[model samples]
Target chain A: MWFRNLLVYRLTQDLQLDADSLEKALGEKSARPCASQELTTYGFTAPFGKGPDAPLVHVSQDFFLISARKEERILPGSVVRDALKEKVDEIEAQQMRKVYKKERDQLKDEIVQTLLPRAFIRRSSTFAAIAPSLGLILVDSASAKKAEDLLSTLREALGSLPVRPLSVKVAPTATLTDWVKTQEAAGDFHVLDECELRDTHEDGGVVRCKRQDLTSEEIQLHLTAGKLVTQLSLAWSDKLSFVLDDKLAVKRLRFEDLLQEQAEKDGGEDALGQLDASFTLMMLTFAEFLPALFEALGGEEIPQGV
Target chain B: MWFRNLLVYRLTQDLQLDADSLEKALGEKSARPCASQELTTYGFTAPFGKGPDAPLVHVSQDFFLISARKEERILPGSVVRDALKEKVDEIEAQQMRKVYKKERDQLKDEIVQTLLPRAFIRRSSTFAAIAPSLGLILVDSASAKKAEDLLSTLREALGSLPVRPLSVKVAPTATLTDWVKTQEAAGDFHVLDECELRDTHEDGGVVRCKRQDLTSEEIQLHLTAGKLVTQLSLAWSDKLSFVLDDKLAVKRLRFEDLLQEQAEKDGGEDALGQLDASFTLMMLTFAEFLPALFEALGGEEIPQGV
Candidate 1:
């Protein structure tokens, strides 16, 4: 269960979390099926995709992995509209009169109630890892909305979760643009052949380059023209590669063969064991990678009073 | 009322069609609501969004505008899976035995049958314009699947519809790349500041630029490095602006003030009259625009035996 994308957050303070405490807290808000009239339901679920009795929290080497499940009823507007129209037509035809707005709205409410039980339910899950020692929370979602939803649910369960999105002292845009312009990256990081550039103006244009040399004259031309790099692909320590955006989110993350081979040797064949091993390997890699990444971006930005 | 994207097709021969004949043909496959167990239904509908009694074919100055409506039941897979799980759990717990694969498949089928009637229906419509005079049928869809669906529906309604996607003798990629390289366009066409470029290699990189001077040194560097233009924004006769792609699809079409103002003056205040006026104006403009565009692209290609 490797994360494909990361939305990293900074923990404001040390969290005193253990497997038992976190599992109990998550169990208090365990996921349940949506009721007939309910449109959505969100709660926690077992991180390891096991039976219902499995633990809600999967901990490996003090790193806690939790999953949040959300269920939504699929009820298209056209369905309700068609039902309402049919009702309105029948009433108008039988009574030989028109159906007004007020009555039409009332009829719509009744139609929804009748259709709610039959609506199909769609389910989705979001996963997150909390490293108390590092004071970091990594969510497996590219969307800010989904990440926040998971964080807020954790807050509701644990009473408080004081964290903010991870930011750096230096603007990622400037640094990334400079890396491509100068054709160099600091420390163990090396720039790859993919990047997205945008004009500095509010409504200016955008340019995306993939599988092309970043140091080529073609790319330098855009940089000279005042386009800032908004997303850049990078490899760190030759063990991991990912695209880092201006927002500090990591996308298209790939674990290089060097690390995957090690994990495969250690993980064995069992599903749960393999997952736990992968999570451990991933967390350990991030432990080293995150610091180097932050240093490359000129250290983490500590908010005022934190 | 206004077509945003055009998936143009060439009519191989003269189409003998009139309002009455076309209306009768479309009536044979008029749009209808999905039955209880039916997953999907597609048929012709009134192009002007009028009532059920309105004509299916909207004829404006020899151009026939027809709409195809599709209704699909929204039965998400998760719903059936959950229902089947519940059944399997109940049986396993009561019988103190396992539910095998065969039984599970049967249960899933039974569950789907039970839920079919309750699934919400989603309805969508695709519009198309048939210009017999120009021997072209323009479907207002950017997706090839949706455009083909409409054409196939028409083929089923009528006995035959001999047509194929419009193709040009000169490759759009080569022509567009040349235009950008030289910063010149033929006749009334002028290159705009937006374009997409790609390396000639099968999996080569891509570059997209918007609101940036296409003729600048930055763009030239890309072309100098063998990047070909795949999509280019262009303005024609100062009357319309649209992005033309390598596949010959016209996207993001915009009518300039000159043509819009003319339509506004002729459309009057009535809704039907406005729609008629707009359709007439759009068809007339396309008649001229299409001819000029074909000529610029080295004229249309007529397949063998056509």
Candidate 2:
């Protein structure tokens, strides 16, 4: 359960609630399998484990662990088409008449419904957290769509959750360019070994330099010539280093000392213990890192402090 | 079609056969369905088009393009367990006796077999190409296991493919540390905004820095005290920037100018056209970058000419 990625979000409105109410609201729609004839179903579930015995919500001090599960039937378009084609061929061969396009469309629905129940079920779960203490909600997913799914589910549970994707003060291109131009890191954030500078225009120009002095005048010249930093990798407050897009979605996030700390402290007696320890460690670290993250995002005027 | 991820493999032995012979051999074992009891089936197919209608292999000039399809029956473990429990309970109720653990295990298999035919089948295809000139085979899979699966299928096609994961000549830690020590980019590679430095000791301490001067004495002090760079993000020329781990797996890879170029030029007539331009762009970029990639990975002693 070590979070390998971060999809950070900001609460449009401050969420002030007690733990019991939050848990009770979420528990009402505890996750269950898709009903028969339903292709997909989504709901919240316990973050720690599965089954009726598991608690629907777990509150570790101020942080609340929330899990969302989506169960869908696996029905590939090609398979469905093939199945329909075979049935059409059978009718045509038996009746000695070609199946009309209009008739085939109707038959397609019949075949799909008939095949629905028999289709294998696929279930996927995403773990996230409600850190009301920080007015932030983090989804442990690399996918933005998946993060949105979790946010939607959370919204349903809370009745109202005015949340939006994290926003930065300066455009990524401008901030990254200046960082390289001055050869300086913003706030506590430090620039790492990877960066990509593209021509601001649509001429299909780019300069990707790794392990080079990004602040060098040569790189500055590229910036002067209109190369903007669209994608740049950075290390954040010694906790995580990752390549981030302009949207600020953390990709390929690697935990350095923090991960090692957990491994050493846990010594990991069993597989289950290892997972539990890692998840706990990740949550704890997130709580501490979340504020620093905003600061590094150039949220100076956001009226928040760690 | 746009290879967002690259699982590069080294051809252990020089391929003796030409594209024609290889194509003919792959045709014999073209993709087919899995046996009733078999969970999975793997075979080669063409990247474009589908079924037997699609060519078994596509040869573009000297490069050979091949795709591997893997079909697997999806039967959830929970579904099987639920079915087995129902069966075991029924037998025990009828007999007015308890079912042994060994018997329950046997019943589980029976339930799986009964459910096998009705289970939905899933099919996935991995696109790859053999660059004979470069002695490299690239799989467009983000996963190492998936890349290996494609390699195994290719091995079966050729009777033997003594290939191994491509290895870097120098340790990234050593190379990156020296670069920072001397404040120079190795070859054309440029250091970017993210990196992790770990103390090379039993305590295994780490330091992740971004947007900071890695060449500064404060960082140099850590390096001087035997800190090892575990991972570093770098930009290669102006084409791509990614964080490469010690194992040489490129993570968080981003193609800077090339992507913008395609987006601008294509304005994306359709999803299909967009995909085509990206695939072509990636292929062209790889051809020019592969040699430089090797050079950056400590190709100091290797041949100079591409």
Candidate 3:
């Protein structure tokens, strides 16, 4: 219900704080409706507007969804400049004098003040999760810019988040390329259907392959030619199938055996029980995948603060 | 359920052919298994693989899923180049002669032929829909290049698919900007929770604002500043929510009321009926949106092929 893709972040340090403390810290900056003239304001708000338990900081079993609310006036720069132009023109005409540079800037500032209150306010929320045990933070966003905004906002709520862009000793492309060549995986991992290959150089065209044998000599040739596996679909412990991109984002996540198993196991009667069961199953599935994924990425390093 | 995003193409020509004729046209080039030496082969494949009535082309009451399969050998260039290098070296060393460029080219070709048999084959499918009444082709792909690939393939299947990129005579940004200023939509459309405005110029940064009054004077200001509305989330018929982008792709699509309504209305216990009902509802919703969307984009034109 939150994100279809996971833009991951490495927690460089232990949060060392529980949901209560984290909520208290974030509560100090509880979100408020945007005021007129305010260009932007961001703080924590209710997670899906649920009860108090799921506040700005929602802690389930081991992971927490920290939601950040951003309210901004949709005042474009051109609009302010246009309004200023009008004011400048009117003053110049009435005063029988050309408005100087200083006067124009002052007029622009005044125009902002004049239109600020009339400007409409827009608000949106971004949710990120902190897996304390794994020392990882996952943002429910696709774009780096949006995810960074949430991370920065989270840092403001807490004293520090101490996160870094996930890094690996061995390049992900090389490892993935090798994996596809052998069709062999370490541990419970195995390559699955579908993959996107792109040339590493300028002629970098992308080729997507699905439902084919990745281990064939032909695919290995693509790897030999300096092409990297940008996206590859893989199965973890035979429980889930997801596409992992070069950016390390897990997308198109499908819980195969897990979803069907839950569907068959009766939580019958109470509709709410069904919802909880599904949520728990999903959370647990990811809880397992994260470590395996981290290991696949050559594991985490020293807590590197961003 | 198949594609999460739709890259749309406007078919300028009316197919003027029924399902039977179209299937015959495409069946002439039905997909085939890849040969040992052949790295790739692509053509029409079965869609839905349903009953006999729906063979290669799965036709519902109206639109049909035109499937395109791309099967390629996963031979990395490096592997072949490496093998070629070895062959070249062995010949040069044995004869004590430097192989000329033409001879080297021949050698490389031989290397590919030698490795072809060992290469593994991979296959992928891209599904597009031909809405006959609307004369619109919708590709269930997010990338422009991929959508174009399918269109080109379709053109081959049918002698011609006179198509064009969905464009607007009245720039969408200008119209959308005005909508935010007016706070009124021409029809059953209204601004929803999120919007993305970016500087149209080269150095333009992006601003994604959500949960704000799009009608507010502030947003109008951004439009005033020459920021184009690259993406805007809107509710259609108050039954669905989706984001429309500048590329004419509809993403993050959600059927709000329609899905819920279907769940409540029992279409009998028959699984087939339930399936039919869901498909019918989805088709109807899109039927309404496509026309309205075309109108919003200033309407379609005569056989303007792309």
Query: Worst 10-residue stretch by lDDT in candidate 1 chain A?
Result: A297-306
lDDT, candidates in the order shown: 0.89, 0.73, 0.70
User: Measured by C-alpha RMSD in angstroms, how accurate is candidate 1?
Assistant: 2.6
Give the per-residue lDDT digits (tens) of candidate 3, residues B1-306.
234567767766667767888889877777777787897887887766433345777666887777887877656675666566567767886998998889988988887787677554556778777887777788877788888887877778778887787776667766766666667655877777568777666654455555545665445655665667777887777777788777677887777765746743745576545544555566667788877876876664434436
Q: What lDDT is reached at residue B104 by model 3? A: 82
Tens-digit lDDT track of model 1 for A1-306: 788889999998777787798899988888999999999999999989666888899888779999999998777787888888789878987998999999999999998898888777888999999999899999998888999999999999998998999999999899998999999997899999999999989888899888889989999988898999999999998788899999998999899876877877888988787888889999999999999889999999986662
TM-score of 1: 0.92
**Regions more than 4 Å wrong, model 1:** A78-111, A303-306, B78-111, B261-269
Error of 3 at A239 (Å): 49
TM-score, every prediction: 0.92, 0.56, 0.44
Q: How does candidate 2 score on lDDT?
A: 0.73
Deviation from native of the Cα of residue B6 in model 1, angstroms? 1.0
User: Every model's DockQ, to 2 decimals?
Assistant: 0.70, 0.08, 0.01
Docking class of 1: medium
- Where model 2 places Cα greater than 4 Å from the true spot, the runs are A201-224, A257-260, A263-284, A300-306, B1-34, B39-115, B121-306
